[PDB]
Design a protein around this nucleic acid. Structure first.
Ligand SMILES: COC(=O)C[C@@](O)(CCC(C)(C)O)C(=O)O[C@@H]1C(OC)=C[C@]23CCCN2CCc2cc4c(cc2[C@H]13)OCO4
Ligand SMILES: [Mg+2]
Ligand SMILES: [Mg+2]
Ligand SMILES: [Mg+2]
Ligand SMILES: [Mg+2]
Ligand SMILES: [Mg+2]
Ligand SMILES: [Mg+2]
Ligand SMILES: [Mg+2]
Ligand SMILES: [Mg+2]
Ligand SMILES: [Mg+2]
Ligand SMILES: [Mg+2]
Ligand SMILES: [Mg+2]
Ligand SMILES: [Mg+2]
Ligand SMILES: [Mg+2]
Ligand SMILES: [Mg+2]
Ligand SMILES: [Mg+2]
Ligand SMILES: [Mg+2]
Ligand SMILES: [Mg+2]
Ligand SMILES: [Mg+2]
Ligand SMILES: [Mg+2]
Ligand SMILES: [Mg+2]
Ligand SMILES: [Mg+2]
Ligand SMILES: [Mg+2]
Ligand SMILES: [Mg+2]
Ligand SMILES: [Mg+2]
Ligand SMILES: [Mg+2]
Ligand SMILES: [Mg+2]
Ligand SMILES: [Mg+2]
Ligand SMILES: [Mg+2]
Ligand SMILES: [Mg+2]
Ligand SMILES: [Mg+2]
Ligand SMILES: [Mg+2]
Ligand SMILES: [Mg+2]
Ligand SMILES: [Mg+2]
Ligand SMILES: [Mg+2]
Ligand SMILES: [Mg+2]
Ligand SMILES: [Mg+2]
Ligand SMILES: [Mg+2]
Ligand SMILES: [Mg+2]
Ligand SMILES: [Mg+2]
Ligand SMILES: [Mg+2]
Ligand SMILES: [Mg+2]
Ligand SMILES: [Mg+2]
Ligand SMILES: [Zn+2]
Lengths: 49, 103, 50
RNA sequence: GAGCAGAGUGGCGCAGGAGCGUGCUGGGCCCAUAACCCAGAGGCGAUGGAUCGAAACCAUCCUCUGCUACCA
RNA sequence: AGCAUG
RNA sequence: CGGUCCUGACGUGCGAAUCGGUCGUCCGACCUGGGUAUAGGGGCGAAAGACUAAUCGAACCAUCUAGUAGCUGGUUCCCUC
RNA sequence: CGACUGUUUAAUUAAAACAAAGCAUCGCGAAGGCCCGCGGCGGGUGUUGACGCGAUGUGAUUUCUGCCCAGUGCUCUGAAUGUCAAAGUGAAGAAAUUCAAUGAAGCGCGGGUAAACGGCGGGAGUAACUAUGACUCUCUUAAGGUAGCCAAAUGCCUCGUCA
RNA sequence: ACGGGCUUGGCGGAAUCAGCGGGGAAAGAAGACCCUGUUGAGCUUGACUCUAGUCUGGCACGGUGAAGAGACAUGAUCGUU
RNA sequence: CUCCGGGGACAGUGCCAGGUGGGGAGUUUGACUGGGGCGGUACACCUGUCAAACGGUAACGCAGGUGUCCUAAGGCGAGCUCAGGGAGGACAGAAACCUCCCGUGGAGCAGAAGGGCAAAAGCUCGCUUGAUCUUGAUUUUCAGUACGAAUACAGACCGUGAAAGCGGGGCCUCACGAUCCUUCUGACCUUUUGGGUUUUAAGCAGGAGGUGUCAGAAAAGUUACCACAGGGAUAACUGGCUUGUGGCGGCCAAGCGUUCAUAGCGACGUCGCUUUUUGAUCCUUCGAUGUCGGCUCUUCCUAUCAUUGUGAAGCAGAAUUCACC
């Protein structure tokens, strides 16, 4: 997505390839916005079980 | 400012000067069945969004103080509205300020 | 903006599965009296890769 | 150059009716030094003004610190 | 419970 | 099959993108004919806002439409006061 | 600089850009997750079932992946005072109407999370030639930039200083 | 406010050929830079106003019984909810 | 007597209601401006000056202020006189309080400035609410429109003083706001429609809630992917006026030059030239005058580095400086 254009993806655009907004989107987001980590309970590297 | 709770002034129903009771005027609750209110409600009902302007750019930080004068005569009970100049602080029946005292 | 590709995937124009060379849908035997009460035996004939 | 922040005990700081931890000095414990305990001394950048009264309010200055000075 | 140094 | 460099030729050209030499790949994520599917705020995109009939940061055709323009251009014979 | 092969603006850019395997998160056990559709017992993934499908970031191999949950997001539990629409209930009134209680999700309140978006200080004194200053004092944050790397495709001063 | 034409001077001689690139503020394209317009479009969000979808409550489809807490027609059966 | 199982009055659907919702739609994103932007408010008001001795008069001119404050700092009446200075008195002093004298305002009058004011317009006392109800007229800005502010009356009802009088806010110049909508106040008020009673609603008059872009739209950005209508009314390059700045050159002569102002320099001052520096301006050019460097090539200037001919040195030679054609 970051390699795309803003007209094409909610992440595309900018002078640097950066998402620019939190990657965790809520479950009740409309189609066309519900990208990234879909309603993530947690993120990052797992530590343990 | 400071305004005493009792004042002797002209009364319209009696036709001469009478003592009065002075209280600050407070705006009443908006009616749900005023002509303007129900016209606005019907206009807003439906589709189309906001139909009337909404004021946003406040400029004034003071409102004119309006006094409610009630004739103390038992069988008159006449009322008037007396507006004074706008002021930041207002109180009724404050203690009189006296000079020649140690601060 | 424009419709994203994950959103385009729903119509299945060029995103439908390629299923010409598949050998069929793998399913268990249907329920009937024989297997409900007793049993029946079948011979294994081929083992295919689909 | 315009806006803006900040000058206060030896050093770093709090803040309308001059102080903190550290430093310094005297005495204690110890053979002695630090640590520890008991006390003490030390001073609002300048000018002018509002105010019964200001380090704190309002202007001008003396420094110092940061932010912008784009587009061709 | 704290107890560095010559 | 493609299109680096000469920023060469040409640049009212042979050509509304061609020519020459030099170049990249050449058993694969390979090249290709026909059939077939996806249609305009839609498709499709190994992603350049690229491509969608010489047209694409929203195709083309007709109509609403003689759209509006505080803005450019023009505005047709004579004499007299 | 990019691992490589590959791809790209037909007609000014073939590249360090895209992709790629590798790595790491996220959702979902089917009345489901992601998505299409004006509409239906509608439709794609799906002739599918977690060694699967869907959404993302980074980008072969080697060696590592430091601290911060305060900010914005995401997500987890609803009984303390909370708030909170419509409908329904009760009462007053001739009735329109008014009042009162009760009261869903959400927002508050309380945990988790950075291979989520992102962030990662200043001022003084100090060693027996000067000079640095391991060390100490202080103000301060959610944390005050760790391992590494450099006038670099990243450094104004700058044509920095030495070779 | 850098004339081929005007003023003052210098001066001037038919018709032509091959080159040339000083000048004609040479040609192309109603400047793409900048500003104005109460003209726009692509895109974004903490702009204003809405909206698909989605979460939740009520009503209807919408039934048959038994137990618990209840308002009910100072303990209790009987029936209204 | 339901084809078998599995759920089941719950999914679900239909209609309302509350959240969420740049996924998507529509729109907006002030003006003045020595180009625009950043800055500022010269956008609504007041004081002195500019302002050229009636009045009026501009610039992002100069120096300042306002969006308040006041039950008295409003209104009468009476009695006093202030700033400061001098001479005295136990603690007491440079500064505490008491006494006399001088004292035209040198004080104070809420605020910025200007004006005005002494048995007062200031200070202290006593009483009070003319800061109240009402119709017109006039002034100021001015279109002789409005708001705001002010003036002179008139009619009630009052305060104060013995009274004459004074007073319907602040000693004067500032201190503030339309239509529509909402809210309160007033009448033995009008309508509420085929008649009547009663709630309700709408009228009439006066206040209040506010528009500071202040005669008063409801309003965030980006475009280096960009479009259109225009502008030389307006920038970037060239040309023009100027010359602060840069460059160059003079006059005077304190001093340097072992003595010696001027061989060569020359401070404190002062007078010019050039457009090969940068500034200021915006006159030409936006229906287009091809922007920086280097290459190539011609010509011109002199403010002369070398060369020809010279004059002067702190010019012995050599070398080096100053000046001339
Ligand atoms: C085909 O390319 C063209 O046409 C040229 C062009 O694009 C290029 C300039 C620019 C992109 C900035 O516009 C242009 O606009 O030139 C304009 C022109 O037309 C030729 C006339 C002007 C006006 C009087 C002389 N000068 C000549 C060059 C020029 C140079 C400039 C400048 C403005 C101009 C203008 O500003 C900074 O330097
Ligand atoms: Mg891109
Ligand atoms: Mg978007
Ligand atoms: Mg509605
Ligand atoms: Mg090419
Ligand atoms: Mg060529
Ligand atoms: Mg040719
Ligand atoms: Mg479609
Ligand atoms: Mg491709
Ligand atoms: Mg791009
Ligand atoms: Mg279209
Ligand atoms: Mg037309
Ligand atoms: Mg106009
Ligand atoms: Mg490569
Ligand atoms: Mg190309
Ligand atoms: Mg990632
Ligand atoms: Mg990390
Ligand atoms: Mg958090
Ligand atoms: Mg380091
Ligand atoms: Mg020519
Ligand atoms: Mg034009
Ligand atoms: Mg054009
Ligand atoms: Mg205009
Ligand atoms: Mg909003
Ligand atoms: Mg939008
Ligand atoms: Mg628009
Ligand atoms: Mg404008
Ligand atoms: Mg005159
Ligand atoms: Mg008097
Ligand atoms: Mg009168
Ligand atoms: Mg007075
Ligand atoms: Mg109107
Ligand atoms: Mg009726
Ligand atoms: Mg009737
Ligand atoms: Mg760009
Ligand atoms: Mg001009
Ligand atoms: Mg020039
Ligand atoms: Mg000069
Ligand atoms: Mg001498
Ligand atoms: Mg002019
Ligand atoms: Mg041309
Ligand atoms: Mg030319
Ligand atoms: Mg000469
Ligand atoms: Zn009365």
């Amino acid at each position: 997505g970051v390699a795309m254009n803003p007209v094409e993806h909610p992440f595309g655009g900018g002078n640097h390839q950066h998402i620019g907004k939190p990657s965790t989107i809520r479950r009740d987001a409309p189609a066309g916005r519900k990208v990234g980590l879909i309603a993530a309970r947690r993120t990052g590297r797992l530590r343990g079980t | 400012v400071n305004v005493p709770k009792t004042r002797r002034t002209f009364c319209k129903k009696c036709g001469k000067h009478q003592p009065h009771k002075v209280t600050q005027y407070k705006k009443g609750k908006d009616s749900l069945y005023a002509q303007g209110k129900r016209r606005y409600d019907r206009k807003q009902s439906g589709y189309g969004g906001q139909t009337k302007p909404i004021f946003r750019k406040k400029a004034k930080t003071t409102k004119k103080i309006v006094l409610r004068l009630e004739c103390v005569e038992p069988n008159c009970r006449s009322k008037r509205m007396l507006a004074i100049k706008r002021c930041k602080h207002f109180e009724l029946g404050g203690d009189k300020k006296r000079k020649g005292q140690v601060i | 903006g424009r419709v994203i590709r994950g959103q385009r995937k729903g119509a299945g124009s060029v995103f439908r599965a390629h299923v010409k060379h598949r050998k069929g849908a793998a399913r268990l035997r249907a329920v009937d009296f024989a297997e409900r009460h007793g049993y029946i035996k079948g011979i294994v004939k081929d083992i295919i890769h689909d």
